[PDB]
Ligand binder design. Structure first.
Ligand SMILES: Cc1cc2nc3c(=O)[nH]c(=O)nc-3n(C[C@H](O)[C@H](O)[C@H](O)COP(=O)(O)OP(=O)(O)OC[C@H]3O[C@@H](n4cnc5c(N)ncnc54)[C@H](O)[C@@H]3O)c2cc1C
Length: 296
């Protein structure tokens, strides 16, 4: 008895103790050379063995041993493809990885373990996959629900999975006819991800898909304030609020951990104008499968 597509969810099929070994088919940098850092899009072969669905994640065990002689524990990554995959053959799984590179106060430039492995993988190399994993970010069963997706950076991944299924695929059970509204937050323009894909769906279905970008280093709002994801949402406040008072509206939030507060604020102000306390209203929504979060 659930409002989400989960009838027969396969989960934890492959364990990190003995994971599924696949091959790297493709790996491409999808952010400009100008961007603040680089994000890559990669397609793995699973030969139909990893039974995932939209909204799930797989874990990856990077090659190597750690500082203390032991092999690396896994890292999770949202699946950036639909169930049938980028090739449509239901025999691939795709990821949206951000290359973690920074410098500690010791002055040293530090490279994240797993993300650099994934970003440095060459077509044909093997990758140890675990999972699938996840039940929170699953799609609503109702093919007419209003699906609002708020994401930042690589948080775009499960939403790209939703959209390829809703607007790029012909399925004899799922004929989406509701509203899908996407808000994507990024710094520079060279950081927008999958834009072409998203713009194509807009023109392909102007009635069912709404698309809003938020480039914080180049866009400004009313008062000349920086355009962060909540800033862009604000411009639709009264509407988003109205949609939230409806019962077939599902909100999804994925991406960098720090995005949740910014949005909360919006939601607070926006809730009181109707004489409501965001904090506990959100508690009811959550309990009703209508406010789903997966930031990290
Ligand atoms: C549910 C879920 C889904 C995820 N989906 C994605 C996804 O789609 N794409 C994606 O790219 N990532 C995703 N991640 C994050 C991913 O799991 C890894 O954490 C990430 O790729 C970095 O791991 P790493 O092995 O490269 O770095 P590690 O070797 O693990 O090092 C990272 C650690 O270094 C420290 N650190 C990080 N930044 C800094 C800094 N600026 N200064 C100082 N110390 C720092 C932190 O302790 C951090 O935990 C997801 C995480 C979760 C939980």
């Amino acid at each position: 008895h659930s409002k989400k597509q989960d009838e027969n969810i396969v989960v934890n099929k492959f364990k990190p103790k003995e994971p599924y070994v696949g091959r790297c088919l493709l790996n491409t940098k999808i952010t400009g050379d100008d961007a603040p850092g680089e994000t890559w899009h990669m397609v793995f072969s699973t030969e139909g063995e990893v039974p995932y669905r939209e909204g799930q994640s797989i874990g990856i065990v990077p090659d190597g041993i750690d500082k203390n002689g032991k092999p690396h524990k896994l890292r999770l990554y949202s699946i950036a493809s639909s169930a049938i995959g980028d090739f449509g053959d239901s025999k691939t799984v795709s990821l949206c990885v951000k290359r973690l590179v920074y410098t500690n106060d010791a002055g040293e430039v530090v490279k994240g373990v797993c993300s650099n492995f994934l970003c440095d993988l060459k077509p044909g190399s093997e990758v140890k996959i675990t999972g699938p994993v996840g039940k929170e970010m699953l799609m609503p069963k109702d093919p007419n629900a209003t699906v609002i997706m708020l994401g930042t950076g690589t948080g775009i991944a499960p939403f790209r999975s939703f959209l390829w299924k809703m607007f790029f695929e012909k399925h004899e059970d799922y004929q989406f006819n509701g509203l899908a509204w996407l808000f994507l937050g990024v710094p520079t323009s060279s950081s927008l991800l999958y834009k072409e894909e998203f713009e194509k769906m807009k023109e392909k279905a102007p009635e069912n898909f709404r698309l809003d970008f938020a480039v914080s280093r180049e866009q400004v709002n009313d008062k000349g304030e920086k355009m962060y994801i909540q800033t862009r949402m604000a411009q639709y406040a009264e509407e988003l609020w109205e949609l939230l008072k409806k019962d077939n509206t599902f909100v999804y939030m994925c991406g960098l951990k720090g995005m949740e507060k910014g949005i909360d604020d919006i939601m607070v102000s926006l809730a009181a104008k109707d004489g409501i306390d965001w904090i506990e209203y959100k508690r009811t929504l959550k309990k009703a499968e209508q406010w789903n979060v997966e930031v990290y």
